[PDB]
A paper describes a structure:
Diversity-generating retroelements (DGRs) create massive sequence variation (1012-20) in select proteins. The archaeal DGRs have in common the genetic elements identified in bacterial DGRs. Thus, a hallmark of DGRs is the substitution of adenines in the TR by other bases in the VR, resulting in protein coding variation.
The structure of AvpA was determined by single-wavelength anomalous dispersion (SAD) from selenomethionine-labeled AvpA and refined to 2.52 Å resolution limit. Thus, while AvpA clearly has a CLec-fold, it is only distantly related to Mtd and TvpA, and likely represents a new subclass of the CLec-fold. In between these strands are other characteristic features of DGR CLec-fold proteins, such as two α-helices (α1 and α2) that are roughly perpendicular to each other, and a four-stranded, anti-parallel β-sheet (β2β3β4β4’), part of which forms the ligand-binding site. The variable region of AvpA (residues 181–203) is located close to but not at the very C-terminus of the protein, as it is for Mtd and TvpA. A major difference is that the variable residues of AvpA do not occur until the end of the β4’ strand, whereas variable residues are found as early as the β3 strand or just after the β3 strand for TvpA and Mtd, respectively. AvpA has two inserts not seen in Mtd and TvpA: Insert 3 (residues 89–114) between β3 and β4, which is composed of loops and two α-helices; and insert 4 (residues 120–179) between β4 and β4’, which is composed of a more complicated arrangement of α-helices and two antiparallel β-strands. In the case of AvpA, both inserts 2 and 4 make hydrogen bonds to the main chain of the VR, with the majority of contacts coming from insert 2.
Author numbering: 2 to 210
Write the structure that this text describes.
Amino acid sequence: EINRKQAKEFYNSDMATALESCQKYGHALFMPELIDAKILATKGSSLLSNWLTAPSIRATGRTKQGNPVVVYVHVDNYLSNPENIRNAERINGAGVMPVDEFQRLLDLGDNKNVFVIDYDKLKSSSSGVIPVERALEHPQTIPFIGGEERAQRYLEKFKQVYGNNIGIWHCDDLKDEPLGRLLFVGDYCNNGLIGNYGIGNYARFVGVR
Ligand SMILES: [Mg+2]
Ligand SMILES: [Mg+2]
């Protein structure tokens, strides 16, 4: 398994330990490259049969003007540092982030590396399995995966590998603090785009050297 360079997978029941191993080796792929890597992979690959974790996050908080928003982050952030995964406060599984950090990510909102979307828009959307047909119009799909092209790309692969219904999952993380969760992409068992999973526990990263 090489992704142009040598690529090892990094599992642990302690997320911080897994990420730390991954970062000692090389660097962990964020969700866009994680997704692509799967698209490049052929039937039989552990990339297709194991669920996977990315240091990408889904964060919920307030803009300076105090509007609730959800942002999907595919760059280095507070929760892609293992020491923070260990030590930050957790509220229903989500890690607490500094207001400064959440606002720094808000300002990086292009629609390419960081996607900001409206809280009510996600909260009114489904959390669960839906036909691939309806996937792309779901508020999570495109920011989650990182681009409309890439998302339609993966949905293609998805129909071929996992089938005709996809899991798009999320929960309500609007609380008195900014809250982040690392993103998971499922397998045959755990199906789809998983953004309601708690931090600190099971994780499987992909590192490249
Ligand atoms: Mg632990
Ligand atoms: Mg805080």
